[PDB]
Design a protein around this motif. Structure first.
Motif, PDB file in Angstrom:
ATOM      1  N   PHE A 164       0.863  -1.174   0.000  1.00 60.10           N
ATOM      2  CA  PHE A 164       0.000   0.000   0.000  1.00 60.10           C
ATOM      3  C   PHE A 164       0.898   1.222   0.000  1.00 60.10           C
ATOM      4  CE2 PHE A 164       0.631   1.494   4.387  1.00 60.10           C
ATOM      5  CZ  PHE A 164       1.010   0.357   5.095  1.00 60.10           C
ATOM      6  N   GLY A 165       0.333   2.343  -0.419  1.00 61.96           N
ATOM      7  CA  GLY A 165       1.080   3.578  -0.474  1.00 61.96           C
ATOM      8  C   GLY A 165       0.594   4.506   0.621  1.00 61.96           C
ATOM      9  N   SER A 166       1.523   5.257   1.203  1.00 61.03           N
ATOM     10  CA  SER A 166       1.143   6.284   2.158  1.00 61.03           C
ATOM     11  C   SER A 166       2.128   7.427   2.056  1.00 61.03           C
ATOM     12  CB  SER A 166       1.128   5.745   3.584  1.00 61.03           C
ATOM     13  OG  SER A 166       0.704   6.838   4.432  1.00 61.03           O
ATOM     14  N   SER A 168       4.840   9.621   0.987  1.00 58.09           N
ATOM     15  CA  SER A 168       5.812   9.466  -0.089  1.00 58.09           C
ATOM     16  C   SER A 168       6.448   8.086  -0.063  1.00 58.09           C
ATOM     17  CB  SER A 168       6.888  10.563  -0.022  1.00 58.09           C
ATOM     18  OG  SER A 168       7.574  10.535   1.234  1.00 58.09           O
ATOM     19  N   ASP A 169       5.769   7.100   0.543  1.00 57.51           N
ATOM     20  CA  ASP A 169       6.336   5.778   0.688  1.00 57.51           C
ATOM     21  C   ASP A 169       5.428   4.730   0.060  1.00 57.51           C
ATOM     22  OD1 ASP A 169       8.495   6.873   2.260  1.00 57.51           O
ATOM     23  OD2 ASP A 169       7.000   7.026   3.903  1.00 57.51           O
ATOM     24  N   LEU A 170       6.076   3.714  -0.461  1.00 62.07           N
ATOM     25  CA  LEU A 170       5.477   2.423  -0.757  1.00 62.07           C
ATOM     26  C   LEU A 170       5.797   1.488   0.397  1.00 62.07           C
ATOM     27  CD1 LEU A 170       4.169   0.477  -2.716  1.00 62.07           C
ATOM     28  CD2 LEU A 170       6.425  -0.119  -3.651  1.00 62.07           C
ATOM     29  N   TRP A 171       4.785   0.853   0.957  1.00 55.43           N
ATOM     30  CA  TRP A 171       4.975  -0.203   1.942  1.00 55.43           C
ATOM     31  C   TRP A 171       4.789  -1.521   1.222  1.00 55.43           C
ATOM     32  CZ3 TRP A 171       4.414   0.189   7.638  1.00 55.43           C
ATOM     33  CH2 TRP A 171       4.586   1.472   8.088  1.00 55.43           C
ATOM     34  N   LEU A 172       5.790  -2.415   1.292  1.00 54.42           N
ATOM     35  CA  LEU A 172       5.703  -3.728   0.671  1.00 54.42           C
ATOM     36  C   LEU A 172       5.890  -4.771   1.742  1.00 54.42           C
ATOM     37  CD1 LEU A 172       8.001  -3.775  -2.523  1.00 54.42           C
ATOM     38  CD2 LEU A 172       5.433  -3.662  -2.383  1.00 54.42           C
ATOM     39  N   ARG A 173       4.981  -5.739   1.777  1.00 56.32           N
ATOM     40  CA  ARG A 173       5.049  -6.807   2.763  1.00 56.32           C
ATOM     41  C   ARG A 173       5.865  -7.937   2.172  1.00 56.32           C
ATOM     42  NH1 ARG A 173       0.117  -9.687   6.027  1.00 56.32           N
ATOM     43  NH2 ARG A 173       1.470 -11.259   7.070  1.00 56.32           N
ATOM     44  N   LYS A 174       6.728  -8.521   2.971  1.00 54.88           N
ATOM     45  CA  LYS A 174       7.449  -9.708   2.532  1.00 54.88           C
ATOM     46  C   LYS A 174       7.560 -10.537   3.783  1.00 54.88           C
ATOM     47  CE  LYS A 174      11.927 -11.365   0.974  1.00 54.88           C
ATOM     48  NZ  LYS A 174      11.623 -12.490   0.043  1.00 54.88           N
ATOM     49  N   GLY A 175       6.979 -11.720   3.774  1.00 50.17           N
ATOM     50  CA  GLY A 175       6.845 -12.417   5.039  1.00 50.17           C
ATOM     51  C   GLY A 175       5.931 -11.629   5.955  1.00 50.17           C
ATOM     52  N   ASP A 176       6.361 -11.418   7.195  1.00 54.96           N
ATOM     53  CA  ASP A 176       5.608 -10.619   8.143  1.00 54.96           C
ATOM     54  C   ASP A 176       6.314  -9.310   8.424  1.00 54.96           C
ATOM     55  OD1 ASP A 176       3.891 -12.737   8.263  1.00 54.96           O
ATOM     56  OD2 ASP A 176       4.579 -13.482  10.193  1.00 54.96           O
ATOM     57  N   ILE A 177       7.075  -8.816   7.469  1.00 57.06           N
ATOM     58  CA  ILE A 177       7.768  -7.547   7.610  1.00 57.06           C
ATOM     59  C   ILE A 177       7.297  -6.628   6.489  1.00 57.06           C
ATOM     60  CG2 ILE A 177       9.978  -6.399   7.525  1.00 57.06           C
ATOM     61  CD1 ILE A 177      11.175  -9.259   8.578  1.00 57.06           C
ATOM     62  N   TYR A 178       7.086  -5.357   6.815  1.00 57.55           N
ATOM     63  CA  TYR A 178       6.879  -4.292   5.831  1.00 57.55           C
ATOM     64  C   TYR A 178       8.161  -3.534   5.552  1.00 57.55           C
ATOM     65  CZ  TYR A 178       1.941  -4.711   5.590  1.00 57.55           C
ATOM     66  OH  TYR A 178       0.699  -5.178   5.370  1.00 57.55           O
TER      67      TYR A 178
ATOM     68  N   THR B 204      -6.614   3.127 -16.430  1.00 61.23           N
ATOM     69  CA  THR B 204      -7.666   2.280 -15.898  1.00 61.23           C
ATOM     70  C   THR B 204      -7.119   1.520 -14.697  1.00 61.23           C
ATOM     71  OG1 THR B 204      -9.483   0.817 -16.563  1.00 61.23           O
ATOM     72  CG2 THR B 204      -7.301   0.252 -17.303  1.00 61.23           C
ATOM     73  N   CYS B 205      -7.978   0.682 -14.141  1.00 66.00           N
ATOM     74  CA  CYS B 205      -7.835   0.086 -12.814  1.00 66.00           C
ATOM     75  C   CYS B 205      -8.227  -1.378 -12.991  1.00 66.00           C
ATOM     76  CB  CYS B 205      -8.745   0.856 -11.853  1.00 66.00           C
ATOM     77  SG  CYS B 205      -9.193   0.324 -10.177  1.00 66.00           S
ATOM     78  N   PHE B 206      -7.248  -2.272 -13.109  1.00 68.26           N
ATOM     79  CA  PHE B 206      -7.579  -3.669 -13.363  1.00 68.26           C
ATOM     80  C   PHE B 206      -7.449  -4.534 -12.123  1.00 68.26           C
ATOM     81  CE2 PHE B 206      -6.596  -2.873 -18.015  1.00 68.26           C
ATOM     82  CZ  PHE B 206      -7.794  -3.358 -18.512  1.00 68.26           C
ATOM     83  N   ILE B 207      -6.480  -4.263 -11.289  1.00 66.01           N
ATOM     84  CA  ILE B 207      -6.211  -5.114 -10.145  1.00 66.01           C
ATOM     85  C   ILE B 207      -5.827  -4.191  -9.012  1.00 66.01           C
ATOM     86  CG2 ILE B 207      -4.634  -6.733  -9.048  1.00 66.01           C
ATOM     87  CD1 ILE B 207      -4.450  -8.196 -11.701  1.00 66.01           C
ATOM     88  N   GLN B 208      -6.451  -4.399  -7.871  1.00 70.46           N
ATOM     89  CA  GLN B 208      -6.228  -3.583  -6.692  1.00 70.46           C
ATOM     90  C   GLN B 208      -5.452  -4.420  -5.691  1.00 70.46           C
ATOM     91  OE1 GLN B 208      -9.634  -1.972  -4.729  1.00 70.46           O
ATOM     92  NE2 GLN B 208      -8.442  -1.156  -2.979  1.00 70.46           N
ATOM     93  N   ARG B 209      -4.357  -3.864  -5.191  1.00 76.57           N
ATOM     94  CA  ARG B 209      -3.599  -4.438  -4.087  1.00 76.57           C
ATOM     95  C   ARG B 209      -3.519  -3.329  -3.057  1.00 76.57           C
ATOM     96  NH1 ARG B 209      -0.813  -9.066  -6.645  1.00 76.57           N
ATOM     97  NH2 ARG B 209      -2.354  -9.589  -8.269  1.00 76.57           N
ATOM     98  N   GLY B 210      -3.990  -3.605  -1.840  1.00 77.08           N
ATOM     99  CA  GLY B 210      -3.982  -2.549  -0.821  1.00 77.08           C
ATOM    100  C   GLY B 210      -4.778  -1.384  -1.364  1.00 77.08           C
ATOM    101  N   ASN B 211      -4.226  -0.170  -1.307  1.00 78.84           N
ATOM    102  CA  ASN B 211      -4.905   1.010  -1.832  1.00 78.84           C
ATOM    103  C   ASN B 211      -4.316   1.440  -3.185  1.00 78.84           C
ATOM    104  OD1 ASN B 211      -2.481   1.878  -0.915  1.00 78.84           O
ATOM    105  ND2 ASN B 211      -3.215   3.637   0.285  1.00 78.84           N
TER     106      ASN B 211
END
Lengths: 219, 219
Positions: A164-166, A168-178, B204-211
């Protein structure tokens, strides 16, 4: 070409150098420091879905005057304990807040309201306060990132979303870590994967008209 | 509840008081004043999909030196006419631009490049210049609104979309007229219809991950 999008998103995720994130947060560490109740924006509103409004109003009047009629909801017992303590001037230790439900029926937390009356107690009670009630955090800290998250980013985080984005950052999950990456890294890897993206403000995107993606407010 | 979205969007459209728009534009008036070529952002780039790059480069070198090898593309005849005229100092009247293809192979228009060499011709040639080449328009004018449109809004406008957002305006089509409403009216009527919305930056908007709503770059 839209048939290739899941594979392109997989390629995109695989382009990031996870040892080179701005920073990272184990989900377990976030949970250790923050009850979900102290993150979600609805905690800061009057708890109208939990109590009749009449009970919230009776409780406000009782707090103003330290007298008058007592709310009836058997859900009101702890709020009454809180209110009557403030009225009688009797101490609530940090241990009281730790075993409390945290959120006051009028919105916000018991701890913040208590520390408004006893400002010497503020630092001891910060752990029981909503992130939106705490002072502006130092830049680069986890609280700072959380305080700057919109409702959509908080919900994605709380739900454990894969990205998800917040701000100016992209948060990416990998395992149980962002892992946090900045916007220019996000955009570079999206470029390289043959992707474009939009950050949604609404929960989801059901119907597109022009460049507007519509959602229902109530799901 | 998402099953109700088309009816809610219809309700939303019906909430607007079209006699009370900020302003409105008949599509026919926009077409009268603006060739699509002078709106779309790709016109401002080197026309690499129309010419081999070698021909664009030969044409640039010919323009610098007024001598040297001649591009070969039979699509190059009018650019050569333009270039050789600038070289020989021979006049191109506004009528030449009006019957021209408007866009120079190196991006941008013949008219703007001509007026850079003959600045007394600038006002006569403005109608043949891209909106992004014209001076900053007066606020509230159609050119102002067009100059402030992102690629996504331009594409929606050009495609005749039933609604799109640009800047602080909602554009709503009714018949062959666009009606502009400000953001607070847009949001109020969306509220009342039980809708939420996002303005997409991607096509367009094809696939949503998070926000994040993902699209392919190339369709």
């Amino acid at each position: 070409n839209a048939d290739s999008l899941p594979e392109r998103i997989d390629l995109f995720v695989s382009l990031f150098d996870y040892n080179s994130a701005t920073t990272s947060y184990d989900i377990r560490s976030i949970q250790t420091d923050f009850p979900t109740r102290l993150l979600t924006p609805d905690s800061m509103l009057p708890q109208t879905s939990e109590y009749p409004l009449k009970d919230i109003q009776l409780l406000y009047k009782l707090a103003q005057s330290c007298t008058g009629k007592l709310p009836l909801s058997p859900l009101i017992t702890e709020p009454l304990v809180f209110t009557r303590s403030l009225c009688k001037g009797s101490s609530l230790s940090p241990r009281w807040f730790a075993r409390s439900g945290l959120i006051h029926p009028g919105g916000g937390t018991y701890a913040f309201r208590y520390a408004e009356k006893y400002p010497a107690q503020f630092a001891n009670l910060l752990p029981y306060m909503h992130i939106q009630e705490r002072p502006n955090a130092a830049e680069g800290t986890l609280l700072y990132h959380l305080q700057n998250m919109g409702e959509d980013a908080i919900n994605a985080l709380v739900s454990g979303a894969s990205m998800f984005g917040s701000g100016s950052d992209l948060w990416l999950r990998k395992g149980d870590i962002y892992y946090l990456f900045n916007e220019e890294t996000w955009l570079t890897n999206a470029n390289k994967a043959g992707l474009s993206y939009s950050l949604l403000s609404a929960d989801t995107c059901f119907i597109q008209r022009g460049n507007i993606c519509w959602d229902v407010e109530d799901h």
